Design a protein around this ligand. Sequence first.
Ligand SMILES: [Zn+2]
Ligand SMILES: [Zn+2]
Lengths: 87, 118, 216, 81, 97, 205
Amino acid sequence: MENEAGQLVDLYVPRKCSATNRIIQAKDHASVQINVCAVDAEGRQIPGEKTTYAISGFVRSKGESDDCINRLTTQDGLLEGVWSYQR
Amino acid sequence: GRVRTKTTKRASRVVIEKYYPRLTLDFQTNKRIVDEVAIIASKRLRNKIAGYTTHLMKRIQRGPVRGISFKLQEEERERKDQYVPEVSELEVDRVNVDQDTKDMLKSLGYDQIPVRVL
Amino acid sequence: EWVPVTKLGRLVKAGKIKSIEEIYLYSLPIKEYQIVDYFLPRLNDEVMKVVPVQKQTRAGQRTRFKAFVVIGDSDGHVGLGIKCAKEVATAIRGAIIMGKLSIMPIRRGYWGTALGDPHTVPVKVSGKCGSVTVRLVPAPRGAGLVAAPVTKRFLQLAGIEDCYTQSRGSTKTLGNFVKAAFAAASLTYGILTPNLWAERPFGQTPIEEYADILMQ
Amino acid sequence: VLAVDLLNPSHESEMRKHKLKQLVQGPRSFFMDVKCPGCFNITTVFSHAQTVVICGSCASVLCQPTGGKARLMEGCSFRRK
Amino acid sequence: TQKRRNNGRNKHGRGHVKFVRCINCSRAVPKDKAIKRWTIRNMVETAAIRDLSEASVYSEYTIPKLYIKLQYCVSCAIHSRVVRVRSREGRRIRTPP
Amino acid sequence: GRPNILNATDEDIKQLLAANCHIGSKNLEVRMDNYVWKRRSDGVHILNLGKTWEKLVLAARVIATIENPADVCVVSTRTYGHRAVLKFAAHTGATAIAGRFTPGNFTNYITRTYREPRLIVVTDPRADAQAIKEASFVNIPVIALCDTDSILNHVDIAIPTNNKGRKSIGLIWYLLAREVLRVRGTLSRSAPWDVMPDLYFYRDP
RNA sequence: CUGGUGCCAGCAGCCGCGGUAAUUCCAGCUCCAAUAGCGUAUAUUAAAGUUGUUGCAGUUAAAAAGCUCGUAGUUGAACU
RNA sequence: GCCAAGGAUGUUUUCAUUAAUCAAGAACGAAAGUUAGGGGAUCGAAGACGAUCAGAUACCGUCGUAGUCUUAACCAUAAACUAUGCCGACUAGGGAUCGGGCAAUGUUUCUCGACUUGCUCGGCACCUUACGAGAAAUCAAAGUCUUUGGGUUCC
RNA sequence: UGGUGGUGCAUGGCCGUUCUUAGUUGGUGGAGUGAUUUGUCUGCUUAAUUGCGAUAACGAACGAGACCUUAACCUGCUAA
Ligand SMILES: [Zn+2]
Ligand SMILES: [Zn+2]
């Protein structure tokens, strides 16, 4: 949020989940974020370059973390032939 | 009831794991080495420790015991763990008992020519 | 002397984590109270109550003094600690430790036009724990803290100057009352407002950014 | 799950569903044309016919009304359109 | 406090069940609420088979047996030890031992 | 996006087929309806090898890009996976736990067994449900070898394999270790690894 | 804090104290809230989300009628 | 055996809002109780005897009244229970089970039936879990309620 | 000032029973809003919470055990 001066005033801006778009609480210990690096031809992944996904504790407890991660990787192009929108 | 105590159990465990290679199954000799290594307060406790130790020696000689380990057993584990036979899951001519997996292989495009059926 | 045992504690001892909000951003569990002490000094605590909860043992009775402590910085951080110990001093210090371990961020907003620093809770936030529900609703500037003395003191330590409170259930149980109020104060960041619609770049995380120092 | 193409369901999924629970409800029956085993005429019969249909030429009972689809007994070939 | 989900007996979709009589005391007990036990016994003792075989005819013919069913009320079953009080967690185990 | 070099590797596909890594159990659990092929007769679910391999490479990439190799925990309560996890921890800088789990390792910061890793790989969620529970408690991502009869609660990456046979366990752990070793460091893709998957198998003996 | 009585005298809105060490009984002292005001009794309001339209509750704390039909009454699928 | 009726299912069958809830108002309403007739084997209120303890007077054993049966008239309640009003929508995983329907170049039987498997609708339920609820026991409803409002009776 | 004048319901020290046997107190974690619970036990065994074993528990301490006295079997190790 911003005041009249236009400067963002708050303790922090909580990270929104990448699957269901929900706020991750400060004590949401079930929520985790995973990182997958970028690989070129013949392995030898490039250091310093990676894409991260945050999965909320509610999703992980419900058991939808695997499917949500599969969907996110398919959208970002890091995974193929495992997640189908048609179902 | 001749059930030993935890002090005797731990004392017996430490002496066997510390002096296994040079230990002797004879009661007089193992009592001797127990006296020379331990700082045991009383002879009665020393004798009970020696008696439990030599019983563990007979038990190990009859069969391996997972409750106690030493350098010889660690070396045996680190030697047997490297055993490897010839390949078993890429051998025996071809895969067997594959009815619908052939259909899934053809659909996937990674079809393997060697297939039996039932 | 404090010796760190967790990786986050070791990083804090090295003084490399920027602020406690960085930890709050990724929800890292806190097991030591020294990290909270270093990142949040001049925390003022209040002892709400001490009660002699007893157990009917075989011969006599096992009595343990239960102490409730609310510790806050009066700037946006509060914590609630309930500890049972044999005496008042050990119970109070224990409850302070739990409060430090349970320090939570409080989001503050404005009743109307955003002028000056935030003064009130942004939206209506509620919390229920054992049939006792506490509802914090925004109040205009200068309206004060219309609450019970316990909840008023909790909100003063929380850093909110204006707020209207509604209470239900058996409020005479102070333990449930403070727990419900703490839940209501802590759930404010859990309400997705239209302000929090921009997507953040999903930062590097302190552990993944500073894992190289985690050697020897 | 948590991402389902409700607008375009799977063809197999629609088949393994009740006639009403589909995205768009519709009949599952069909009208077929039957020729008598010893004649040349045509007759249109319903899959779930409730009454016995009688051929106008020399023929036996065309179909038997069961609980669901009508039983076909004589040696006739049916076309579905 | 509803101790058992069944309320002590298995009955669903019904309003009345014809009652039966106990054995040890012959009390009025509902058909489902009773305890049904099977006692398949032989007509001779285990040690009496030899005596019967020595003193029987028809080329050591097969000795018959008796099948009888016993219905026990709650109090009689507990007293006769065919049914015993179990813990709260162990109450749910409906499988026979 | 995804390079074509990370592919089926037909030879390893045949190895998985011979090791019965697609012959699952009789239940489905719904949560892995997408990971199974058409239902074989007498109620045996066959797992999609292409999807299984894709999840395996994804798991290997997740295990990669970790700055400290020593904060990757491995859990295997069942005796089948003892050899596989020991060889995984020998070839890779990760750590492995076999048999007893001693609940309270990731929590209970006072005990000596406290380690706090960064990522946990689990041989079987059903047999290691304690480890997954503590990982959810202490904010750690989870990769697990899961069958059709496995609960996927608090499991972020799942490898849909048999998870039951010793051949399936050993081959998958060998493939996972080989993939993570080919992703970085050494052991180029063209050159086959000197070690072979039968080393990961656990003998009686 | 000090003298007198000692489950008595008595307080005491409620809990509760009073059977010789009475911080609650009556006398001295000090302090506390208000101040030319303080206290008491009654009627009402807020408390009472214990009259609930906002806004109660009905398995076990008070309460789903033995069941069914059905009139006033209430509510009433989508489309111009 | 006859008569009248009922739900579910199948249906490219017919009308087209004809529906939900009920103050009042009425039908049915266990057992026991009442009025009479017929009938009354066993059990059995009341009662009759004999141990029983100090007293038994009640439990126990035998007999035994009204009653238990039926016909024609009554009433109107019980732990009449799922201690949980009715209608409508949504909400997770599994396996059994009753009725119906669909499919099987599956097994079997002197044209169909029996068994098995899959899908679906309508019921009786069971196990796990708790996103969710509660004061908790517990609950797929007692959930979708301080983020409080789908409609409507009783209390 | 003395009191073998009273108060063991004011107590100190001690002693006798509970208990000639076998449990007790924490901490860090897990469950419950809370009182509380696990740790402190399916099983086997011992006099023993003694031990093996699984084990949301882990790590500890006290006690028991352990320790000390006595009773015989024997050693020419400085003896009377
Ligand atoms: Zn015809
Ligand atoms: Zn009986």
